[PDB]
Amino acid sequence: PEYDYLFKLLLIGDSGVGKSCLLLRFADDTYTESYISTIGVDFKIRTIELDGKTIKLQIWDTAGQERFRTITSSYYRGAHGIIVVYDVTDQESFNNVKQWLQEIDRYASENVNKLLVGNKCDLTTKKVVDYTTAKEFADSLGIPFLETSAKNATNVEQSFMTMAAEIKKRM
Amino acid sequence: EMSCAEKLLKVLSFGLWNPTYSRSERQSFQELLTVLEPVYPLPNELGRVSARFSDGSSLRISVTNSESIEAEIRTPNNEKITVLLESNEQNRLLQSLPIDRHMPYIQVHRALSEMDLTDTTSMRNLLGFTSKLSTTLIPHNAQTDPLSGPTPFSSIFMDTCRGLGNAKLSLNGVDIPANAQMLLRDALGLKDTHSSPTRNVIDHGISRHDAEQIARESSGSDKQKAEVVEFLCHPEAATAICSAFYQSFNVPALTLTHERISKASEYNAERSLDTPNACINISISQSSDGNIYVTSHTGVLIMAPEDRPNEMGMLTNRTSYEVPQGVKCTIDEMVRALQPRYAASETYLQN
Amino acid sequence: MRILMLGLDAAGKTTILYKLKLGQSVTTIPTVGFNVETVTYKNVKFNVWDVGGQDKIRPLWRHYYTGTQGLIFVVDCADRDRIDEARQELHRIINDREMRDAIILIFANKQDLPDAMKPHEIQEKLGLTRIRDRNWYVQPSCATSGDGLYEGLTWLTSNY
Ligand SMILES: Nc1nc2c(ncn2[C@@H]2O[C@H](COP(=O)(O)OP(=O)(O)OP(=O)(O)O)[C@@H](O)[C@H]2O)c(=O)[nH]1
Ligand SMILES: Nc1nc2c(ncn2[C@@H]2O[C@H](COP(=O)(O)OP(=O)(O)O)[C@@H](O)[C@H]2O)c(=O)[nH]1
Ligand SMILES: [Mg+2]
Ligand SMILES: [Mg+2]
């Protein structure tokens, strides 16, 4: 055991709102559309250093299409965190953020660290969700909401480590 | 002077998997098998395959439900040659053919001589092959049907943006390179992952302008190119291309081996095997009759069963269907009209 | 020997039938019709007839009773919620005069799962213990590997 921690993070949310772009920029510091839509569940790793501890990570990515709902449930089990990502430019993806939270209750552990994220903020011209509108539902439930972007790398490192610490609290 | 088509048919008849091949020859075969494109099968058929080689020859293999394999060829001097074939446990013929069959279990295939799994390129090179092999028709219930539920064919458009230019496309044997796809992605009015095809592109298909271009930037004889143009001009064609990229077509098969699929993801995340999530290999052909057949099989690395440890392979979830003459590229019609057949197959490296 | 494989759905019948015919394990698919293969173990040929166990095609099991030399009732040692539903069908099977006389081999499949149910337990659960005047056995097995699958065969052989 060369690592001090083993955490498993799951990324759920509407399909098309950058759950992969946020998983690649955080694991590989890159961004491109040369990749095809994720089919099922993807698995990446990125070890960090916080509080002088080897925090090895095991991020699990999942599709968004309603059909992949039944198949994704078999992953909410040993989840130490759940980053319900939503597109801040697509109103639809903002409403469903509530539904993805429900799925979490039915399947993920009662004490799962819920971390909200509004990705794709660079395109402010075509944005629809005010930092206040979202933060409202977020702070209403104790969800550390942060606006990020996998393109500008805004809060990509920040909004991600937030879970790495929020989890170290229960341990 | 054995015609190109005659070669392939001869090989497949003796056994594409025959270990006696000096490997040097395996290369000689891969180049032909990848030219086989599944097309609209006749009523009493279980699968039809066509291929237009460079020597002007052509091959047409049919497979009745009685698993009867009839084949027809046409040498450069148009010499219609019909040859009845037979498949035995020796040549595994009925295996080296892109045809979904009724099997009690997911079909298992073995790659060829060198095919190895390492980088993005090594993945596509494999899928190019497996997609030309048989599969196992997987049933689907209303709960796992890619066309049921609340939002059917919802991401069909966005699934194409991040799809085109990164997939192995084929329109009547005419390979559609990267730049080619990116050109189509434009004519389809699919800019951002939130836009939808222009109202005009739906009623009239791809403008004769963009369409004609895509052809020029595609591998194929001048004669062939022209065809791709007449195809990319009908409103139906749009519905056929945007649908083939659907992401949920994998649900039917995934819900069968999604467990072993993740085990493969783990063995890679740790091994730092630089390999993308999945790969798409599409094959769209329009018979002279007018029918439009779309075959889109997706590739995904999967871990072999329990008995065979530490042996990785690739699952090929195939999805074939027809495009009714009239179905326009709209999230709605696509769901009411189309009836896709889902079938996958596991392929493991030769190690 | 004409063997007839039966049991609740998702019990692991096809997984077994084709586990012997191939040796290697395969990703079985919901049987809607009926799989019939021929395996030869212990210098003896077996004629297995795997019939679907869907709640729908359950009644078509009688169309296979006649001409049955043996009954291989596969049972999911973990699906306790339907473990009883098993004895329900099992009894209804071994009673009908058609198969009133044949050896009966009960497979305790899925012994690898945590909630595994010991054989002697399935024996009293299915209601095989109280019922005598007949030949049977409860063989522990795991289709995903092959444990007991072959011994269960050697059983049919020695007991006939
Ligand atoms: N975990 C586990 N799964 C098993 C075991 N044996 C079989 N299975 C799985 O059980 C599932 C169903 O197997 P089948 O043989 O198709 O079930 P069946 O009852 O024959 O199917 P129908 O006859 O169509 O109802 C498959 O996923 C098998 O791989 C086992 O020992 N352990
Ligand atoms: N402009 C912009 N686009 C983004 C950003 N993040 C994601 N996207 C879009 O989302 C697509 C890929 O996101 P994706 O991973 O497929 O979403 P997912 O499938 O739900 O994980 C790309 O084609 C981008 O156009 C961003 O920060 N800026
Ligand atoms: Mg994804
Ligand atoms: Mg079965």
Q: How many whole angstroms separate alpha carbon A123 and alpha carbon C17?
A: 58
Instruction: Provide the residue type at B184 as one letter.
Output: L
- C-alpha B80/C-alpha B72 separation (Å) is 7
Long-range CB pairs of B60-63, under 8 A, 24+ apart, other chains included: B61/B9, B61/B36, B61/B85, B61/B97, B63/B94, B63/B97, B63/B99
- Structural domains present in chain C: 2-114+135-141+150-158 (3.40.50.300)
What six digits make up the tokens of A41?
């569940």
d(CA A112, CA B284): 45
Q: Within 10 Å of residue B275's Cβ, how many Cβ atoms?
A: 21
Resolution (A): 4.1
Query: Which residues from chain B sit within 8 angstroms of residue C55, using beta carbons?
Result: none
Strand pairing partners for B342? B319
Pocket around ligand 2 at a 6 A CB cut-off = A 15-21, 33, 37-38, 64, 119-120, 122-123, 149-151; B 161-162, 192-193
Probe target for ligand 1 pocket from C28, C49, C113, C149, with the most ligand atoms within 8 Å of CB = C28
Residue nearest atom 26 in ligand 2 by C-alpha distance = A120
Q: For residue B194, what are its two tokens?
A: 């939130």
**Where in the sequence is the domain holding A95, given as residue range(s)?**
1-171
Closest CA to C109 of C136, C72, C84: C72
Residue C140 Cβ inside 6 Å of ligand 1? The answer reads no
Q: Do C27 and B138 touch (CB under 8 A)?
A: no
Q: Which residues contact A39 (CB under 8 A, 6 or more apart)?
A: A63, B247, B250, B254, B277, B278, B298, B300
Chain breaks in chain C (C to N over 2.5 A) after: none
Catalytic residues of C: 54
CA distances (Å), C42 to each of B59, C16, C152, C156, C160, in order?
A: 47, 17, 11, 11, 13
- Closest-CA residue, ligand 1 atom 13, reads C12
Cβ of A44 within 8 Å of Cβ of B269? The answer is yes
Element (H, E) at B269: helix B251-269
Other chains touching C, judged by 3 or more CB pairs under 8 Å: B
Q: Whole-angstrom Cα distance, residue B199 to residue B194?
A: 15
Among B118, B134, B99, B12, CA closest to B349: B118
- Among candidates B37, B70, B31, which has minimal Cα distance to B54? B31
What is the token pair recorded at C88?
């329900």
* Integer Cα distance of C6 and B266 in angstroms: 37
CA C81, distance to chain mean position in Å, is: 19
Closest CA to B334 of B267, B248, B221: B248
DSSP conformation letters of A118-171: EE--S-GGG----HHHHHHHHHHHT---EE-BTTTTBTTTHHHHHHHHHTTT--
Closest ligand to residue B277's CA = 3
Type of residue numbered B189: G
Q: Are B147 and B340 in contact (CB under 8 A)?
A: yes
Ligand number nearest to the C-alpha of C17 = 1
Six token digits for residue B257: 């081996």
- The size of chain B, in residues, is 351
C49 close to C64: Cβ distance less than 8 angstroms: yes
Residue C151 in 3-state DSSP?
A: helix
Q: Please name the chains neighbouring B, where neighbouring means 3+ C-beta pairs under 8 angstroms.
A: A, C
Whole-angstrom distance, CA of residue B82 vs CA of residue C63: 44
CA atoms within 13 A on the CB side of B101: 22
> What is residue C142's DSSP assignment?
B
Strands A81-82 and A5-11: what pairing? parallel
- Contact between C122 and C44 (Cβ < 8 Å): no
Q: What is the C-alpha to C-alpha distance for residues A4 and A52, in angstroms, rounded to an integer?
A: 10
The CATH 3.10.450.460 domain(s) of chain B lie at 1-94
Residue type, B219: S
User: Would you give the distance in Å from CA B259 to the centre of its chain?
Assistant: 24
Atom of ligand 1 nearest to the CA of C9: 25
A45 touches chain B (CB under 8 A): yes
C-alpha distances (whole Å) from C156 to each of C2, C40, C45, C64, C149 are: 11, 12, 11, 19, 11
Confirm if B224 and B232 have CB atoms less than 8 A apart: no
B89 in C contact zone (CB under 8 Å): no
- CB B215 within 8 Å of CB B237: no
Residue pair A140/A133 in contact by the 8 Å Cβ criterion: no
The structural domain count of chain A equals 1
Return the H-helix or E-strand segment holding A49.
strand A48-49
Cβ neighbours of residue A82 closer than 8 Å, sequence gap 6 or more:
A9, A10, A11, A12, A76, A104, A108, A112, A113, A114, A115
Q: How many residues does chain A have?
A: 171
Ligand 1 nearest atom to the CA of residue C7, by list position: 19
Asked if B300 contacts B314 with a C-beta cutoff of 8 angstroms, the reply is yes
- Assess contact for B274 and B119: CB atoms under 8 A: yes
Which of B165, B197, B161 has its CA nearest to residue B182?
A: B165
Tell me the CATH number for domain B1-94.
3.10.450.460
Q: Is B152 left (phi over 0), alpha (psi -120 to 50) or beta?
A: beta
- Method used to solve the structure: X-ray
Number of the ligand closest to the Cα of C7: 1
Query: Taking phi first (over 0 means left), then psi (-120 to 50 degrees means alpha), and beta for anything else, what does residue C23 get?
Result: left
Mutate to test the pocket of ligand 2, among A22, A35, A120, A148 (most ligand atoms within 8 A of CB): A120
* CA B56 – CA B58 distance, rounded (Å): 7
In the β-sheet with A85-87, what is the strand arrangement from edge to edge? A85-87, A117-119, A146-147
Question: Which of chain A's residues have a Cβ under 8 Å away from the Cβ of B155?
Answer: 15-16, 37, 64-65
Q: Is B149 in the C-facing interface, judged by CB distances under 8 Å?
A: no
Contacts of B302 (CB under 8 A, 6+ apart): B257, B260, B261, B263, B264, B312, B313, B314, B315, B346
